[PDB]
Design a protein around this ligand. Structure first.
Ligand SMILES: CCC(O)(CC)COc1c(C)cc([Si](C)(C)c2cc(C)c(OC[C@@H](O)CCC(=O)O)c(C)c2)cc1C
Lengths: 12, 239
């Protein structure tokens, strides 16, 4: 799996 | 007693919480509405939970040291802890009147039956209420509350963590800050008793996490239920 949404939220 | 660095940490965590917990609950009007479907509350409470996940991520990013972790370790810590921090942070709206979560209006007030109308059984809800009652009876200052949330997130014993020693070093600083704060407010043995009960709470959260995970897996396996979830919930709680 990957977590583009969580990652995107981590990069805010 | 409390060093300048310990005061710094507490100030930062208090501010992080003030920036990510909205006690007006104003955004609840943007969720799919509560309906009182057998799982008639799942649209509303899936939106609420998914919103809360976003706030937990915002809080976590401001924990001193969390930035020093790799992106992989940041993701695994958040994935593992999100449900626990949600259970912890929801205690601020919990009320001992009717054993419910009161978010400013009758529409946005949630009891055991509301949670069951999102799919969970008393296997989870009974210990969750017992948890909320016991946490409430600790009567924590906000300083202890935000430290506990941060300690909850930065735990080196989460599965998948790659730099456990770094995670442990971060958590140790937070744990030292909390132990010193308790000592400043309470002589022994009350200080030791209070810290011991806070540690027991973190253990309780792990059991609640496991039971939520079991029930979430069974529920989200039905596509008619997953269809009602949000993309963020599916990503964070899936896998
Ligand atoms: C969708 C997956 C599923 O598993 C259902 C299939 C979720 O299940 C649930 C779980 C795990 C916990 C809960 Si609850 C501990 C009663 C809770 C949670 C929150 C976020 C909350 O909001 C208060 C503040 O948190 C405001 C927001 C903020 O934190 O800023 C309140 C008042 C109560 C309810 C459900 C339905």
């Amino acid at each position: 799996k990957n977590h583009p949404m969580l990652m995107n939220l981590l990069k805010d | 007693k409390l060093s300048e660095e310990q005061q710094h940490i507490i100030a930062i965590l208090l501010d992080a919480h003030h920036k990510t917990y909205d006690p007006t609950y104003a955004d609840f009007r943007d969720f799919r509405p509560p309906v009182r479907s057998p799982l008639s509350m799942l649209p509303h409470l899936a939106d609420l939970v998914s919103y809360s996940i976003q706030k937990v991520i915002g809080f976590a990013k401001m924990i001193p040291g969390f930035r020093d972790l790799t992106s992989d370790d940041q993701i695994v810590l958040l994935k593992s802890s999100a449900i626990e921090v949600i259970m912890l942070r929801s205690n601020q709206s919990f009320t001992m009147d009717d054993m419910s979560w009161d978010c400013g209006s009758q529409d946005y007030k949630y009891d055991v039956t509301d949670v069951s109308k999102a799919g969970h059984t008393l296997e989870l809800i009974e210990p969750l209420i017992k948890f909320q009652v016991g946490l409430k009876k600790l009567n924590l200052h906000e300083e202890e509350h935000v430290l506990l949330m941060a300690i909850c997130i930065v735990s080196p014993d989460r599965p998948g963590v790659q730099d456990a020693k770094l995670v442990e070093a971060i958590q140790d600083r937070l744990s030292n800050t909390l132990q010193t704060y308790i000592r400043c407010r309470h002589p022994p043995p009350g200080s030791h008793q209070l810290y011991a009960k806070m540690i027991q709470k973190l253990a309780d959260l792990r059991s609640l996490n496991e039971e939520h995970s079991k029930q979430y897996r069974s529920l989200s396996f039905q596509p008619e239920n997953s269809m009602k979830l949000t993309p963020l919930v599916l990503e964070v709680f899936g896998n």
